[PDB]
């Protein structure tokens, strides 16, 4: 709303890892095939569609902006895990 109204907004997605966990729970409660670490394949699509909605707009739209600050809790200090 702010981004398209010409203003600038900060949004912080705290613990999107628990977001992925909740989506995994919803998917396996829907009898969906598990994937890597049983995460359903659309875990990438979820975060993708979620994050790409935050970018700087050009001058013709109104030059609004939306800045996203996701929070991911790596477990074991490793950035080579699927969700990270």
């Amino acid at each position: 709303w702010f981004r398209d109204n010409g203003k600038h907004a900060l949004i912080v997605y705290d613990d999107l890892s628990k977001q992925a966990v909740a989506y995994r729970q919803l998917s396996l409660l829907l009898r969906r095939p598990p994937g890597r670490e049983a995460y359903p394949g659309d875990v990438f699509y979820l975060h993708s569609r979620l994050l790409e909605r935050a970018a700087k707009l050009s001058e013709k739209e109104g030059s609004g902006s939306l800045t996203a600050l996701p929070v991911i809790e790596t477990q074991g200090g490793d950035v080579s895990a699927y969700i990270p």
């Binding site: 909740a22 995994r24 729970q25 396996l28 009898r31 477990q75």
Partner: protein
């Protein structure tokens, strides 16, 4: 009114399927009841399968069941007898006294399935709760309404810590703790009940300070996943209607998670990560969100946590880690050789240990104590090799001071009175910080190290030094 009745269609393991009539199906999580010769088999509704059939999970052994047996709906969830009468009685998941000391005379009867207090009712201030144990309320203080995780073991005085906490909370503010023996071994349970009677916490003729709810390990799955909810309901009633700072003890939260995963497999849900239920986080949050501080009172939970395969990365330990605040890693014979508490202060940590909560001076003294202990531990190797000579004058001073601090961490227990001989003392946290900072400043070096051993307040250190001098010359 007309009772709601139905017929049993299938019992598959602990899972029981019951067919009801039109417009008679209850909501899920409701309590069902059948008349068996042994007693009351109660069924918690889990899913509606259509065609007026519900899928329920048995809280007790389902043996000798016949299709077409009559069932009755209670009307709501499993309701446990709740009140001050519960203190001193052994109660189960279904709310039946297994203490065979007569029926429970509680006037109120609350369901075990409730909602956590709303966001507005949640307390907006991080509060401190005095523990009585000097090392605990100095280096890893407990959160008023926290989720303390006991990382102990065997032969470490895990129980005696529990009774000391119960006695200290009963003396300090209002404490009427509730012990929840999820997956009780029924031998340790009997020993614990005998210890309750001996320690005086449970007073059969008098008043008791703790209600012993536990489902034994031989119970069917689901009862082990609901005993915690029963105990939590008891504690919440004691908090929301009396304004006390109630405690709650969990035998093993890992056992609760294992039971929850076990229940989901029986229903037919796909295990998510490691044979674990897909609703692990949801169940953990549901259990751990009602255990919180409110405007009226507070309830603090002390749960014992088992780490599978000593793996900190296992999903259930992490889910429990989401709700801990502070932790207490009882030393496996490290500090038990000597200091009776044996809490391993260099491993037990706390999130509230900040100047904004405990105060600047408390943070300062705790930080100095922990760094002195760390330096002394680091020098212990070369102390073992050569001794005391290789250390510089400041190194020797720090080593001796840290040894004094390590001896002074000990505190006599009011529940260990019958054990050896020593009068336990409820050392206040202010007295604790004052005593530890006085030792820190370095004006008590001439007092011997053993004058801090089995000693509470610092004036007791002085008195013990005086009696040592008197018996010396």
């Amino acid at each position: 009114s007309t009772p709601i009745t139905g017929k049993v269609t299938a019992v598959i393991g602990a899972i029981v399927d019951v067919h009801f009539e039109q417009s008679e199906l209850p909501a899920i999580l409701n309590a069902l009841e059948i008349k068996t010769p042994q007693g009351k088999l109660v069924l918690e509704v889990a899913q509606h399968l259509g065609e007026n059939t519900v899928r329920t999970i048995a809280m007790d052994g389902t043996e000798g069941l016949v299709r077409g047996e009559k069932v009755l709906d209670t009307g709501g969830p499993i309701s446990v007898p709740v009140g001050r009468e519960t203190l001193g009685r052994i109660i189960n998941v279904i709310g039946e006294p297994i203490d065979e000391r007569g029926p429970i005379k509680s006037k109120l009867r609350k369901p075990i399935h409730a909602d956590p207090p709303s966001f507005a009712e949640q307390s907006t201030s991080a509060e401190i709760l005095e523990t009585g144990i000097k090392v605990v309320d100095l280096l890893a203080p407990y959160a008023r309404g926290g989720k303390i995780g006991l990382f102990g073991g065997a032969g470490v005085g895990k129980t005696v810590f529990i009774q000391e906490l119960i006695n200290n909370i009963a003396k300090a503010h209002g404490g009427f703790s509730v012990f929840t023996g999820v997956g009780e071994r029924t031998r340790e349970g009997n020993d614990l009940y005998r210890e309750m009677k001996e320690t005086g916490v449970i007073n059969l003729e008098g008043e008791s300070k703790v209600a012993l709810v536990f489902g034994q390990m031989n119970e069917p799955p689901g009862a082990r996943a609901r005993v915690a909810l029963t105990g939590l309901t008891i504690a919440e009633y004691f908090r929301d209607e009396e304004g006390q700072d109630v405690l709650l003890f969990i035998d093993n939260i890992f056992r609760f998670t294992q039971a929850g995963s076990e229940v989901s497999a029986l229903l037919g849900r796909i295990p998510s990560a490691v044979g674990y239920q897909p609703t692990l986080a949801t169940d953990m949050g549901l259990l751990q969100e009602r255990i919180t501080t409110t405007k009226k009172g507070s309830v603090t939970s002390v749960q014992a946590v088992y780490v599978p395969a000593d793996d900190l990365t296992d999903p259930a330990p992490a889910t429990t880690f989401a709700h801990l605040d502070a932790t207490t890693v009882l030393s496996r014979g490290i500090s038990e050789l000597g200091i009776y508490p044996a809490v391993d202060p260099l491993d037990s940590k706390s999130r509230l240990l900040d100047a904004a909560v405990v105060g600047q001076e408390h943070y300062d003294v705790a930080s100095k104590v922990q760094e002195t202990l760390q330096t002394y531990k680091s020098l212990q190797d070369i102390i073992a090799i050569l001794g005391m000579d290789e250390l510089s004058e400041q190194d020797k001073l720090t080593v001796e001071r840290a040894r004094k601090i390590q001896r002074f961490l000990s505190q006599p227990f009011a529940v260990a009175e019958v054990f050896t001989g020593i009068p336990g003392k409820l050392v206040r946290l202010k007295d604790t910080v004052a005593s530890f900072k006085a030792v820190l400043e370095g004006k008590y070096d001439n007092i011997p190290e053993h004058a801090f051993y089995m000693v509470g307040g610092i004036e007791d250190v002085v008195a013990k030094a005086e009696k040592l001098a008197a018996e010396a010359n």
